[PDB]
């Protein structure tokens, strides 16, 4: 038995093929039975059976290379990937997660757990660049797939690996989490442009956990305290209520029970 | 890479035709497909284009809502309706690669791959 | 492990961007609640505590409906001597504030400062749209849809056009009352002349604050006219017709939008 697999290729990618990809990812991350203030909640980690813990994302590119990312359904985030006969995993946060990832890619020959987790701070450190200076788009993703692939054969060094994780995590995990960020990647494909995410995108990414908490702990959608976000030009504004977020956020991490 | 046009022929004023443009091969780097037309002694005139990334259509000035350019699973079509004698011309399908930005190529010199053209003749 | 239920203190912003306001800052029982320009200070009469018991309180007293039939006024009242059912409210995700006992909704039937608030039969009109928040300004955004094109206002007409960040006519003010207003004329509103499919949407005066002027951004990317159930739709998926219509939900690309700010 294998976890559910969703496919995307950069070769000939269109606005439609990327949209279908992201929608299929969301459909396998959660059933949609738990919806709060019209925003779907991901499954609760506690008591989630191991056979339901992950989904796989097989990426292919024009160079006819493939890698398979593993995503944790409880937070939509990349935990590792497989290239050929090797698997690679971010440093687990705890003992239970360390056991959990042994259920991924079980027939792979070699397995490596990195010193670093997948948080942006460290990946930016390793890449030598902040998110605001790493271009996203179909071109960057095509290159990230090749980089991820050639890491297994010795052809990719760590800073390029880190940059490739940053590209994939935003174009897959953050796009699944946010219609807004899916729309941003849609735009890059639409106009065949690559560009770094503007401050509105970065701040949404940084705020996903706190937004999930604020919405689920709200009194009927009104927050106990504001969440500060940014416009595309970097100016700041505060959000006190779920209303404006309904078209912006597509998935939330499970914080508590209704 | 070869493009082939089909579907030209004879009709009378007010009639309709549907042209098709089939590539010999599918390349995945195409940015725009386009239809042009040419009569003797005039330059080639932009008729219609289709943006590959999302299917957005574009039309030349003299096709005044009368034509529809479209794409299918696996071929680009030009549906021509309410044809006037002024639409008689050789019609060509063309391909553009590597375009980047929010606009569209609409001039003959912006498309580098060309079919041989199919003749359209409108009676009366 | 149940979610915490806090009691936020917020303004309540509604019709034309005005705030729910205990008139003159006086708190004797029966004093009217009104629309008033949103303050920036800490005055109690515009700061509402959303209590766990479904009351809405200012300076410790309750937002209270005078009665259970359409058109009666809304007042401040001692929470324990008021009729309990008259102090109960639910705040809906679609912006409605409803009194469960009567099923009537908080309303401002005029748009002027000083308008006394009433309870009314729910018709999801702009006069019945509210937002609990301390944001006193509308959310200004572009609205992107089919083929990446931008919703654009041209006097009374609305259509989708190639996006340009230089174009004030492509900027939209998302008001607390559910209205979508062209940034260059905040007295105008995205308006459907009826609740019926294929009505061409226009830009008209916000004066009626009607059911045809209230819109909700849904989680699936559609922009929904609450009262009719119909969504904003690029007619025949053809931008060249320069017509946006109401149409039943199907979720194809000509019904999908995104607020890009
Ligand atoms: C991503 O790509 C993989 C590989 O192509 C997809 O899995 C494959 O799905 C096929 C069905 O779409 C399977 O083949 C068919 O089997 C049926 C049996 O009745 C036959 O009728 C039919 O003619 C085909 O032979 C194929 O076995 C399978 N390959 C695997 C699992 O390695 C994958 O599809 C997704 O996973 C499978 C397990 C099914 O649940 C699909 O419904 C599901 O969509 C692709 N992912 C997506 C999201 O499309
Ligand atoms: C929207 O703006 C209003 C006006 O500033 C904010 O109200 C203020 O909220 C703070 C903290 O929530 C209140 O302070 C608290 O006072 C209690 C009572 O002693 C104390 O126990 C707490 O530790 C804290 O100091 C403050 O009184 C209140 N101001 C008022 C009512 O005039 C409001 O928080 C904003 N709402 C949101 C969601 O941000
Ligand atoms: C505006 O928001 C309100 C509240 O979210 C919506 O009203 C609610 O809509 C749901 C779904 O239509 C109703 O669900 C029903 O629940 C009852 C009892 O739980 C059950 O008998 C049905 O099987 C159905 O599941 C819900 O009752 C209803 N009312 C409340 C108080 O939640 C309202 O529809 C929204 N208006 C628009 C135009 O979207
Ligand atoms: Cl390492
Ligand atoms: Cl940097
Ligand atoms: Cl133009
Ligand atoms: Cl011929
Ligand atoms: Cl008083
Ligand atoms: Cl009573
Ligand atoms: Cl006034």
- Domain borders along chain A are 1-176, 177-258
Residue entry with tokens 């989630």: A48
Distance from residue C21's CA to the centre of ligand 8 (Å)? 13
Residues 6+ apart with CB under 8 A from C90: A220, C54, C97, C98, C100
| CA C104 to each of CA A255, B54, C14, C66, C83: distance values in angstroms, whole numbers, following the listed order | 33, 46, 16, 12, 16
C92, C126, C178, C226: which to mutate for ligand 3, most atoms within 8 A of CB? C92
Q: Residue B35: which CATH number?
A: 2.60.40.10
Annotated catalytic residue A45: no
User: Closest-CA residue in chain A for C91?
Assistant: A220
Residue of C106, C18, C17, C97 lying closest to C50 (CA atoms) = C97
CB contact under 8 A, B54 and A193: no
CA neighbours within 13 Å on the CB side: how many for C104? 23
Phi then psi for residue A181, to 5 deg, are -80, -35
Query: A251 a known binding residue?
Result: no
The position carrying tokens 């990946």 is A123
Write the DSSP assignment of C66-109 as a string of letters.
S-SSTT-BEEEE-TTTS-GGGG--EE-TTS-EEETTTTEEEE-S
Tell me the residue range of the domain where B29 lies.
3-122
Nearest-angstrom CA–CA distance, A170 and C56 = 41
Q: How far apart are CA A136 and CA C40, in angstroms?
A: 40
**Torsion over CA: A119, A124, A127, A131 (sign):** positive
Q: Which of C68, C80, C156 is nearest to C118 (CA)?
A: C68
Which two tokens mark A37?
A: 């203030």
What is d(CA B99, CA C77) in angstroms, rounded to the nearest whole number? 66
The closest of B76, B99, B78 to B18, measured between CA atoms, is B78
| Closest CA relative to residue C21, chosen from C46, C42, C58 | C46
- For chain A, how many residues are written? 258
Contact C135 A242 (CB under 8 A): no
Residues with CB under 6 A from ligand 1: A 5-7, 24
Determination approach: X-ray
Q: Which residue of A has its CA nearest to B51?
A: A190
Residue B87: strand, helix, or coil: helix
The partner residue sitting opposite B100, judged by closest CB among A14, A15, A192, is A192
Considering only the C-alpha atoms of chain B, give the largest distance between any 2 of them, rounded to a whole number of Å.
43
Chains with ≥3 CB–CB distances under 8 Å to C: A, B
End-to-end CA distance of chain B: 38
Spatial separation of the C-alpha atoms in residues C258 and A183, rounded to whole Å:
7
Contact A3, A54 (CB under 8 A): yes
Q: How far apart are CA C191 and CA C225, in angstroms?
A: 10
Atom of ligand 1 nearest to the CA of A4: 36
- B17, two tokens: 């035709």
| Ligand with the closest atom to the CA of A22 | 1
Q: What does the alpha-carbon distance between residue B95 and residue B110 come to, in Å, rounded to a whole number?
A: 9
Q: Do C240 and B59 touch (CB under 8 A)?
A: yes
Of residues A174, A182, A184, A205, which has the active-site annotation? Answer: A174
Chain A hits for B98, CB-CB cut-off 8 Å, are 192
A18 annotated active-site: no
Structural resolution in Å: 2.1
Any binding-site annotation on A124?
Answer: no
Task: Please spell the DSSP secondary structure of chain A, one letter per residue.
Answer: ----EEEEESTT--HHHHHHHHHHHHHHH--S--EETTEEBPPPSTT--GGGSEEEEEEE-TTS-EEEEEEETTTTEEEEEEETTEEEEPPPSSHHHHHHHTTSSTT-SEEEE-SS-S-HHHHHHHHTS-GGGS-BSHHHHHHHHHHHHHHTTT---HHHHHHHHHHHIIIIIIHHH-HHHHHHHHHHHHTT--BPPPHHHHHHHHHHHHHHHHHHTSBTTEEEEEEEEE-TTS-EEEEEEGGGGTTT---B---SB-
Residues of chain C found within 8 Å of residue A224, distances taken between Cβ atoms: 6, 8
Q: What's C179's DSSP letter? A: -
Assess whether the C-beta atom of A225 lies below 6 angstroms from ligand 2: yes
Chain-chain contact of B53 with A191 (C-beta, under 8 angstroms): yes
Distance from the Cα of B30 to chain A's closest Cα (Å) equals: 8
Q: What is the CA radius of gyration of chain A?
A: 18
Q: Taking CB atoms and an 8 Å cutoff, what residues of chain C touch A219?
A: 5-8, 50, 52, 91
Q: Is residue A225 exposed (0-12), middle (13-18) or buried (19+ Cβ within 10 Å)?
A: exposed
Residues 6+ apart with CB under 8 A from A86: A108, A109, A110, A111, A112, A152
Q: Name the CA dihedral angle for A123, A127, A129, A135, rounded to a multiple of 10 degrees.
A: -90
Out of C5, C148, C221, the one facing A219 most closely (by C-beta) is C5
Tell me whether residue A82 is one of the annotated catalytic residues.
Answer: no
* Nearest of B36, B33, B14 to residue B89 by alpha carbon: B36
Crossing angle of the two packed helices A158-168 and A138-151, in degrees rounded to 10: 130
Instruction: Point out the ligand 3 atom lying closest to the alpha carbon of residue C98.
Output: 31
CB of A223 closer than 6 A to ligand 2? yes
Q: How is residue B47 written in tokens?
A: 């008729």
Closest by CA to A56, choosing from A25, A86, A33, is: A25
Structure-block tokens of residue A24: 């299929």
Rounded Cα distance between B53 and B50, Å, is 9
Distance B76 CA to ligand 7 centre (A): 18
Q: Which residue of C lies nearest to B64 if distances are taken between CA atoms?
A: C240
Rounded to the nearest angstrom, the distance between the alpha carbon of C162 and the centre of ligand 6 is: 8
| Nearest CA among C111, C105, C98, C116 for reference residue C70 | C105
Q: How far apart are the first and last CA of chain A?
A: 33
To the query of whether residue A120 is one of the catalytic residues in this protein, the response is yes
* Strand C150-154 with C157-161, pairing: antiparallel
3-state secondary structure at position B27: coil
Interface probe, candidates A9, A15, A138, chain B, greatest B C-beta count within 10 A:
A15
Rounded Cα distance, A133 and A156, in Å: 20
Q: Please name the residue of chain C whose CA is at the shortest distance from the CA of residue A256.
A: C3
Q: With the C-alpha atoms ordered C160, C162, C167, C173, is the resulting torsion angle positive or negative?
A: positive
B54 → closest Cβ in C147, C162, C163: C147
- C94 is known to lie in a ligand binding site: yes
- Are A67 and A57 spatial neighbours (Cβ–Cβ below 8 Å)? no
Which residues, at least 6 apart from C94, have a Cβ–Cβ distance to it below 8 Å?
A: C124, C178, C216, C226
Number of domains in chain B: 1
**For residues A186 and C258, what is the distance between their CA atoms, to the nearest angstrom?**
11
């Amino acid at each position: 038995k294998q976890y559910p697999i969703i496919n995307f290729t950069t070769a000939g990618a269109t606005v439609q093929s990327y949209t279908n990809f992201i929608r299929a990812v969301r459909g396998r991350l959660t059933t949609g039975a738990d919806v709060r203030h019209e925003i779907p909640v991901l499954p609760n980690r506690v008591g989630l059976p191991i056979n339901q813990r992950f989904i796989l994302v097989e990426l292919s590119n024009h160079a006819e290379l493939s890698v398979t990312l593993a995503l944790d359904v409880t937070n939509a985030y990349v935990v590792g990937y497989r290239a050929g006969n090797s698997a690679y995993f971010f440093h687990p946060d705890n003992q239970e997660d360390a056991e959990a990832i042994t259920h991924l890619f079980t027939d792979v020959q070699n397995r490596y757990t990195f010193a670093f987790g997948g948080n942006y701070d460290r990946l930016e450190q390793l890449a030598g660049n902040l998110r605001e200076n790493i271009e996203l788009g179909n071109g960057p993703l095509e290159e990230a797939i090749s980089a991820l692939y050639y890491y297994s054969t010795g052809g990719t060094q760590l800073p390029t690996l880190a940059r490739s994780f940053i590209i994939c995590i935003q174009m897959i995990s953050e796009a699944a989490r946010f219609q807004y960020i899916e729309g941003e990647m849609r735009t890059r494909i639409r106009y065949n442009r690559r560009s770094a995410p503007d401050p509105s995108v970065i701040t949404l990414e940084n705020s996903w956990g706190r937004l999930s908490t604020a919405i689920q702990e709200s009194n009927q959608g009104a927050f106990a305290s504001p969440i500060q976000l940014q416009r595309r030009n970097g100016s700041k504004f505060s959000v006190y209520d779920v209303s404006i977020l309904i078209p912006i956020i597509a998935l939330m991490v499970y914080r508590c029970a209704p | 890479l070869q493009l082939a046009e089909s579907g030209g022929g004879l009709v009378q004023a007010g009639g309709s035709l549907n042209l098709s443009c089939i590539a010999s091969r599918r390349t995945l780097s195409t940015s725009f497909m386009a239809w042009f037309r040419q009569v003797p002694g005039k330059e080639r005139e932009f008729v219609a284009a289709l943006r590959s990334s999302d299917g957005r259509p574009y039309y030349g000035d003299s096709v005044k809502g009368r034509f529809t350019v479209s794409r299918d699973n696996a071929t680009v079509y030009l549906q021509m309706n309410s044809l006037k004698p002024e639409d008689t011309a050789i019609y060509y399908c063309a391909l553009n690669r590597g375009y980047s930005g929010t606009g569209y190529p609409s001039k003959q010199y912006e498309y580098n791959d060309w079919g041989q053209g199919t003749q359209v003749t409108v009676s009366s | 492990d149940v979610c915490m239920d806090p009691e936020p203190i917020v303004r309540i912003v509604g019709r034309n961007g005005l705030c729910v306001d205990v008139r003159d800052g006086r708190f004797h029982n029966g004093n009217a609640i009104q629309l008033w320009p949103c303050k920036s200070n800490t005055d109690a009469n515009q700061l509402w505590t959303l209590k766990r018991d479904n009351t809405i309180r200012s300076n410790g007293k309750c937002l209270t409906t005078y009665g259970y039939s359409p058109g009666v006024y809304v007042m401040i009242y001692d929470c324990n001597t008021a009729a309990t059912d008259a102090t109960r409210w639910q705040i809906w995700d679609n912006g409605t504030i409803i009194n469960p006992r009567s099923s009537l909704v908080l309303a401002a039937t005029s748009g002027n400062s000083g308008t006394t608030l009433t309870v009314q039969t729910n018709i999801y009109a702009v006069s019945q749209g509210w937002l609990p928040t301390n944001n006193t300004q509308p959310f200004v955004t572009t609205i992107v849809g089919l083929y990446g094109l931008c919703l654009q206002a041209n006097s009374g007409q609305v259509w989708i056009e190639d996006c340009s960040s230089e174009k004030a006519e492509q900027q939209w003010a998302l008001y607390a009352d559910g209205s979508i207003r062209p940034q260059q004329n905040r007295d105008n509103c995205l308006t459907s002349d009826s609740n019926i499919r294929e009505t061409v949407v226009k830009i008209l005066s916000c004066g009626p604050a009607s059911s045809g002027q209230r819109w909700m951004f849904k989680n699936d990317g559609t922009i929904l006219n609450l009262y009719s159930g119909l969504v904003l739709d690029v007619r025949a998926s053809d931008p060249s017709l320069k017509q946006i219509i109401l149409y039943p939900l199907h979720g194809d690309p000509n019904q999908i939008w995104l607020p890009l700010f």
